[PDB]
Coordinates of N, CA and C in Angstrom, one line a residue:
X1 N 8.2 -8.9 0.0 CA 7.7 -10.3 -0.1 C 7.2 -10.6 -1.5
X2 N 6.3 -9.7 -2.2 CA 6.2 -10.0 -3.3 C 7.4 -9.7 -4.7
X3 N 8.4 -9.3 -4.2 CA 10.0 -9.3 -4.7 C 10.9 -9.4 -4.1
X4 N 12.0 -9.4 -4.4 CA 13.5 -9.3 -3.5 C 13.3 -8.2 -2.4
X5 N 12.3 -7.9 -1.5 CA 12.1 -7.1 -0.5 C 12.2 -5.6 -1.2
X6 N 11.1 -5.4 -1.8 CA 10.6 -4.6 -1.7 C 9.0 -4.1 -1.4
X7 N 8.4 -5.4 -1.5 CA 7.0 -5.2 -1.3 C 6.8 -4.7 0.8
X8 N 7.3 -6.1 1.3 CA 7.7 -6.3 2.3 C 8.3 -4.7 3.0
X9 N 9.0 -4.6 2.5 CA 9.4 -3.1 2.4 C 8.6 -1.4 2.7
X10 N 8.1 -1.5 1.7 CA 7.1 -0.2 1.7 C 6.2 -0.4 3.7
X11 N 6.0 -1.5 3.6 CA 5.7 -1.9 5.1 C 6.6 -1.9 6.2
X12 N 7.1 -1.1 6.3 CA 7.8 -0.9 6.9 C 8.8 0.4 7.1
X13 N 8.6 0.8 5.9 CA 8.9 2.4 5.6 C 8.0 3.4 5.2
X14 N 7.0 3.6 4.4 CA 5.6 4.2 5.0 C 5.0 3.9 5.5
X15 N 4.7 2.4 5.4 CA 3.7 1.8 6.9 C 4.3 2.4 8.5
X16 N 5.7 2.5 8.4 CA 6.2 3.1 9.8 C 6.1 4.4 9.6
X17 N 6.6 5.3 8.4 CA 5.9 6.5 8.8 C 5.2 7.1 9.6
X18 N 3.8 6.5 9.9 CA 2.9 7.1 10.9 C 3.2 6.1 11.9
X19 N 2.5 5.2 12.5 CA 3.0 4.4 13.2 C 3.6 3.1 12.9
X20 N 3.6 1.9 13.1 CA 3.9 1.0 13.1 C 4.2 0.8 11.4
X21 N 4.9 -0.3 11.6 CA 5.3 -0.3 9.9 C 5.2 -1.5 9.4
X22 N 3.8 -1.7 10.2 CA 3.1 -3.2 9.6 C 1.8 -2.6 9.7
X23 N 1.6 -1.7 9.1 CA 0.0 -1.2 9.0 C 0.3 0.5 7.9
X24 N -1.0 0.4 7.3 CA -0.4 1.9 6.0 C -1.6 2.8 6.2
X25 N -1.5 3.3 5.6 CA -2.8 4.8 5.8 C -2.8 5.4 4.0
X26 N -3.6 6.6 4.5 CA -3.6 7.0 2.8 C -2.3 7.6 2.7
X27 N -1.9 8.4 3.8 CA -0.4 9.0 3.2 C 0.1 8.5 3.2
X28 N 0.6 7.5 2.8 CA 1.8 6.5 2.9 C 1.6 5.0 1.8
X29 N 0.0 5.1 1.2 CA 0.1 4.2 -0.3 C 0.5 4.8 -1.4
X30 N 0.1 6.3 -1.6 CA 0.8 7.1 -2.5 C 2.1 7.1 -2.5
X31 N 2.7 7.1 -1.6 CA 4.3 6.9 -1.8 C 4.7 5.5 -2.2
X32 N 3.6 5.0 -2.3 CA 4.6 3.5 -2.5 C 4.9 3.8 -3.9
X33 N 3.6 3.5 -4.6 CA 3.8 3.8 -6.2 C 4.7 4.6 -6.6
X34 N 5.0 5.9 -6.0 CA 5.8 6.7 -6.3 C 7.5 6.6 -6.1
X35 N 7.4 5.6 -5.3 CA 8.6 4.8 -5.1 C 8.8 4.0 -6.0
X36 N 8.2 3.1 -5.9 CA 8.3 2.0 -7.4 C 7.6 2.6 -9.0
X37 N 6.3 3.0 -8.8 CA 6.0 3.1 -10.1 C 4.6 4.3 -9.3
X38 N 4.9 5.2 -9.3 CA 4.0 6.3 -9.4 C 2.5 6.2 -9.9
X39 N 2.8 5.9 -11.0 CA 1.6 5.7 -11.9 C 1.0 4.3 -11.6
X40 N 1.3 3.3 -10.4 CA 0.7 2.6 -10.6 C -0.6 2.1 -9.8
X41 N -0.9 3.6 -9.7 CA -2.5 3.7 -8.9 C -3.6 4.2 -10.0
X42 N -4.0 3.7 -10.7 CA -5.4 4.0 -11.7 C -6.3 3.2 -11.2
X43 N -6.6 3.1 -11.9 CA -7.9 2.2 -12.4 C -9.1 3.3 -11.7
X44 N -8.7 4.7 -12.4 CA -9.4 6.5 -12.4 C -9.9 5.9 -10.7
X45 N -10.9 7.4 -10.6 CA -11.1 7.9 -9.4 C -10.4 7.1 -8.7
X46 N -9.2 7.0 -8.5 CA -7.6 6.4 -7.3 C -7.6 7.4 -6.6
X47 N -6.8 7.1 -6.0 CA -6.2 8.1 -4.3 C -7.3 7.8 -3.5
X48 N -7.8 7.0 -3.8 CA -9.0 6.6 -2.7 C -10.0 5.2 -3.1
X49 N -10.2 4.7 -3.9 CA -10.9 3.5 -4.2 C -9.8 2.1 -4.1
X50 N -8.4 3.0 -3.6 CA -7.6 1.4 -3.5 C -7.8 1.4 -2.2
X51 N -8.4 2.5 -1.4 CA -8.1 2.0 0.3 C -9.6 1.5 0.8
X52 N -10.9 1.5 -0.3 CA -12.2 0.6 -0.3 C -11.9 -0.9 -0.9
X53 N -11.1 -0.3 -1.7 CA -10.8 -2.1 -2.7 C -10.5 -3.2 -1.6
X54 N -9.7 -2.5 -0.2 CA -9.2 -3.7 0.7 C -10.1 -3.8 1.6
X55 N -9.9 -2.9 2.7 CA -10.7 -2.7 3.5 C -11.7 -2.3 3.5
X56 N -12.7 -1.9 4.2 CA -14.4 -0.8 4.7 C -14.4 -0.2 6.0
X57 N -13.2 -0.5 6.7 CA -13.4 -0.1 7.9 C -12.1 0.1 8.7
X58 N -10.8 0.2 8.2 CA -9.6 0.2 8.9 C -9.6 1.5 9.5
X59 N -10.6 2.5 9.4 CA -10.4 3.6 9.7 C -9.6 4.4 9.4
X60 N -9.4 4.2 8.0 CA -7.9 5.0 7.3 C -7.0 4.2 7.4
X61 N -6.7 2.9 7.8 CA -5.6 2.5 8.5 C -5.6 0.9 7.0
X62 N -4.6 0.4 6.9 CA -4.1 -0.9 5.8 C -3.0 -1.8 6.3
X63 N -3.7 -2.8 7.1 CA -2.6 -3.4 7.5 C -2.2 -4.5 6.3
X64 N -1.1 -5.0 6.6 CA -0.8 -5.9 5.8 C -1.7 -7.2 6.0
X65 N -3.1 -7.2 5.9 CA -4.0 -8.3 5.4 C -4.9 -7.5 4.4
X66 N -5.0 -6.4 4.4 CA -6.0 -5.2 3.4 C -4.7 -5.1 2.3
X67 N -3.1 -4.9 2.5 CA -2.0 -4.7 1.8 C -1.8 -5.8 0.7
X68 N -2.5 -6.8 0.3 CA -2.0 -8.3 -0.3 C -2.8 -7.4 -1.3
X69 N -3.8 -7.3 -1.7 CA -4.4 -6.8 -2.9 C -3.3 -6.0 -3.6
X70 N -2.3 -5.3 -3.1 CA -1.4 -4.3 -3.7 C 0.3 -5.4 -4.0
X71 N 0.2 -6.2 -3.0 CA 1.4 -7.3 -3.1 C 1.4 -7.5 -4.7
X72 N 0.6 -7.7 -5.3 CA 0.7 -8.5 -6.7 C 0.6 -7.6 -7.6
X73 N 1.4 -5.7 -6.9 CA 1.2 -5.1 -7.7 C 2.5 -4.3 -7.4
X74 N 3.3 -4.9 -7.1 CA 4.9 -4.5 -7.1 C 6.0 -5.7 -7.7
X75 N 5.9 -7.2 -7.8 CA 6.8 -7.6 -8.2 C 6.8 -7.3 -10.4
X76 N 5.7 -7.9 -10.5 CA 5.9 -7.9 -12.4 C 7.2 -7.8 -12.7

């Protein structure tokens, strides 16, 4: 969504990973970046402050309305 389908994408291929593939978890944002751009989880102590940046309470879980903060971080 936020490019020629790839944003859209990751939702649906790690987001399905675990279940459904309109919703993400922690294992399955790391792979995004690492699919597109690895490195593009900083902004330090990462691997975990991107899944408070959306949500507080998915329970581990990022659906695509916690996932828009990350949209505008795959097309550039």
């Amino acid at each position: 969504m936020k490019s020629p389908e790839e944003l859209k994408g990751i939702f649906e291929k790690y987001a399905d990973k675990e279940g459904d593939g309109n919703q993400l978890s922690k294992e399955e944002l790391k792979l995004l970046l690492q699919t597109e751009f690895p490195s593009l989880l900083k902004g330090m102590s990462t691997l975990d402050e991107l899944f408070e940046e959306l949500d507080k309470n998915g329970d581990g879980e990022v659906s695509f309305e916690e996932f828009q903060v990350l949209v505008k971080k795959i097309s550039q």
